[PDB]
Write a protein that holds these residues in place. Structure first.
Motif, mmCIF file in Angstrom:
data_model
loop_
_atom_site.group_PDB
_atom_site.id
_atom_site.type_symbol
_atom_site.label_atom_id
_atom_site.label_comp_id
_atom_site.label_asym_id
_atom_site.label_seq_id
_atom_site.Cartn_x
_atom_site.Cartn_y
_atom_site.Cartn_z
ATOM 1 N N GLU A 77 26.235 -77.947 1.481
ATOM 2 C CA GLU A 77 24.849 -77.581 1.568
ATOM 3 C C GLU A 77 24.787 -75.971 1.789
ATOM 4 O O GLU A 77 24.065 -75.377 1.128
ATOM 5 N N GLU A 78 25.449 -75.549 3.084
ATOM 6 C CA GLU A 78 25.042 -74.444 3.429
ATOM 7 C C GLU A 78 25.954 -73.363 2.635
ATOM 8 O O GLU A 78 25.533 -72.253 2.432
ATOM 9 N N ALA A 79 27.032 -73.791 2.290
ATOM 10 C CA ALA A 79 27.797 -72.817 1.222
ATOM 11 C C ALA A 79 27.164 -72.800 -0.247
ATOM 12 O O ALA A 79 27.177 -71.565 -0.712
ATOM 13 N N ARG A 80 26.281 -73.745 -0.541
ATOM 14 C CA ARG A 80 25.616 -73.469 -1.818
ATOM 15 C C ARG A 80 24.576 -72.692 -1.526
ATOM 16 O O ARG A 80 24.022 -71.987 -2.583
ATOM 17 N N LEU A 81 23.733 -72.541 -0.449
ATOM 18 C CA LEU A 81 22.838 -71.440 -0.347
ATOM 19 C C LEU A 81 23.612 -70.140 -0.335
ATOM 20 O O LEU A 81 22.544 -69.339 -0.839
ATOM 21 N N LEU A 82 24.500 -70.015 0.159
ATOM 22 C CA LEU A 82 25.121 -68.753 0.119
ATOM 23 C C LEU A 82 25.748 -68.342 -1.372
ATOM 24 O O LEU A 82 25.706 -67.083 -1.701
ATOM 25 N N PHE A 83 26.162 -69.276 -2.230
ATOM 26 C CA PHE A 83 26.426 -69.135 -3.315
ATOM 27 C C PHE A 83 25.924 -69.955 -4.373
ATOM 28 O O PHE A 83 26.138 -71.369 -5.120
ATOM 29 N N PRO A 84 24.379 -69.914 -4.803
ATOM 30 C CA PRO A 84 23.623 -70.659 -5.470
ATOM 31 C C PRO A 84 23.644 -70.596 -6.965
ATOM 32 O O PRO A 84 23.312 -71.478 -7.716
ATOM 33 N N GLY A 85 24.038 -69.342 -7.300
ATOM 34 C CA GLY A 85 24.174 -69.133 -8.800
ATOM 35 C C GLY A 85 25.557 -69.773 -9.422
ATOM 36 O O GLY A 85 26.416 -70.055 -8.585
ATOM 37 N N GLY A 86 25.803 -69.560 -10.594
ATOM 38 C CA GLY A 86 27.069 -70.207 -10.813
ATOM 39 C C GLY A 86 27.020 -71.619 -10.748
ATOM 40 O O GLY A 86 26.167 -72.214 -10.000
ATOM 41 N N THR A 87 27.809 -72.358 -11.357
ATOM 42 C CA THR A 87 27.933 -73.769 -11.856
ATOM 43 C C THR A 87 28.366 -74.993 -10.597
ATOM 44 O O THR A 87 28.973 -74.461 -9.868
ATOM 45 N N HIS A 88 27.703 -75.855 -10.598
ATOM 46 C CA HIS A 88 28.120 -77.241 -9.607
ATOM 47 C C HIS A 88 29.498 -77.198 -10.149
ATOM 48 O O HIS A 88 30.281 -77.268 -8.818
ATOM 49 N N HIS A 89 29.853 -77.370 -11.153
ATOM 50 C CA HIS A 89 31.400 -77.476 -11.239
ATOM 51 C C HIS A 89 32.428 -76.586 -10.489
ATOM 52 O O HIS A 89 33.339 -76.880 -9.892
ATOM 53 N N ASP A 90 31.977 -75.224 -10.731
ATOM 54 C CA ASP A 90 32.807 -74.028 -10.418
ATOM 55 C C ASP A 90 32.856 -74.441 -8.828
ATOM 56 O O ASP A 90 33.699 -74.077 -7.996
ATOM 57 N N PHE A 91 31.638 -74.491 -8.178
ATOM 58 C CA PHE A 91 31.347 -74.537 -6.663
ATOM 59 C C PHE A 91 32.092 -75.643 -6.234
ATOM 60 O O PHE A 91 32.964 -75.279 -5.262
ATOM 61 N N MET A 92 32.256 -76.699 -6.826
ATOM 62 C CA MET A 92 33.041 -77.869 -6.300
ATOM 63 C C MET A 92 34.704 -77.703 -6.455
ATOM 64 O O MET A 92 35.360 -78.074 -5.511
ATOM 65 N N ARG A 93 34.931 -76.956 -7.489
ATOM 66 C CA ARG A 93 36.240 -76.595 -7.668
ATOM 67 C C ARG A 93 36.730 -75.674 -6.506
ATOM 68 O O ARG A 93 37.912 -76.052 -5.923
ATOM 69 N N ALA A 94 35.884 -74.570 -6.140
ATOM 70 C CA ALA A 94 36.131 -73.776 -5.256
ATOM 71 C C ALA A 94 36.317 -74.489 -3.752
ATOM 72 O O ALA A 94 37.126 -74.252 -3.057
ATOM 73 N N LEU A 95 35.216 -75.221 -3.498
ATOM 74 C CA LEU A 95 35.180 -75.778 -2.144
ATOM 75 C C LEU A 95 36.071 -77.114 -2.009
ATOM 76 O O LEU A 95 36.789 -77.259 -1.033
ATOM 77 N N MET A 96 36.141 -77.849 -3.002
ATOM 78 C CA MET A 96 37.115 -79.048 -2.843
ATOM 79 C C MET A 96 38.665 -78.548 -3.118
ATOM 80 O O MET A 96 39.636 -79.154 -2.294
ATOM 81 N N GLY A 97 39.011 -77.578 -3.737
ATOM 82 C CA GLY A 97 40.153 -76.798 -3.694
ATOM 83 C C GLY A 97 40.496 -76.450 -2.349
ATOM 84 O O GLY A 97 41.744 -76.866 -1.904
ATOM 85 N N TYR A 98 39.685 -75.905 -1.721
ATOM 86 C CA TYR A 98 40.141 -75.439 -0.142
ATOM 87 C C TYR A 98 40.046 -76.768 0.592
ATOM 88 O O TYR A 98 41.294 -76.825 1.501
ATOM 89 N N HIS A 99 39.108 -77.839 0.593
ATOM 90 C CA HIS A 99 39.580 -79.224 1.039
ATOM 91 C C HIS A 99 40.710 -79.645 0.948
ATOM 92 O O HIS A 99 41.415 -80.049 1.912
ATOM 93 N N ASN A 100 41.007 -79.764 -0.145
ATOM 94 C CA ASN A 100 42.243 -80.522 -0.464
ATOM 95 C C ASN A 100 43.620 -79.817 0.112
ATOM 96 O O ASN A 100 44.545 -80.369 0.564
ATOM 97 N N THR A 101 43.617 -78.412 0.101
ATOM 98 C CA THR A 101 44.642 -77.535 0.522
ATOM 99 C C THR A 101 44.825 -77.729 2.063
ATOM 100 O O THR A 101 45.825 -77.879 2.485
ATOM 101 N N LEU A 102 43.452 -77.582 2.706
ATOM 102 C CA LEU A 102 43.616 -77.620 4.201
ATOM 103 C C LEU A 102 43.977 -79.249 4.795
ATOM 104 O O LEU A 102 44.695 -79.256 5.605
ATOM 105 N N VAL A 103 43.530 -80.174 3.826
ATOM 106 C CA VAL A 103 43.866 -81.563 4.124
ATOM 107 C C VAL A 103 45.427 -81.521 4.260
ATOM 108 O O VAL A 103 46.064 -82.197 5.197
#
Ligand code: CL
Ligand code: CL
Lengths: 60, 55
Positions: free
Chosen positions: A27-53
């Motif tokens: 939610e807070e990351a989306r406030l900082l990066f509100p433009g651009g697509t939900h798809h790209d947002f999740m790709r960026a954030l979940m790519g980080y998630h997966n990597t960190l896990v």
């Protein structure tokens, strides 16, 4: 390579926020990066998630 | 909109070899705005996930 990005170890990082849940962190990351697509947002954030896990799991 | 993601692999999404690589890939997707805001977003996620995983 983009040298402003260095390897981040799987420990708390000072000067950056910590949220109650990964839900809230998204939610807070989306406030900082509100433009651009939900798809790209999740790709960026979940790519980080997966990597960190994977990094956390592979350690001992 | 969003739901809590557990500290486990998410098969729908990519995995990168290092956190540096994951940050680079995220910045390719979100090249706008300041480095500070980008890091606030990504490190806010990092910190949150680390805390869940650490105990
Ligand atoms: Cl570099
Ligand atoms: Cl940057």
């Amino acid at each position: 390579g983009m040298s402003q990005f260095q390897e981040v170890r799987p420990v708390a990082q000072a000067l950056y926020p910590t949220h109650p849940s990964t839900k809230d962190a998204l939610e807070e990351a989306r406030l900082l990066f509100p433009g651009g697509t939900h798809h790209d947002f999740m790709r960026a954030l979940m790519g980080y998630h997966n990597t960190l896990v994977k990094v956390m799991e592979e350690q001992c």
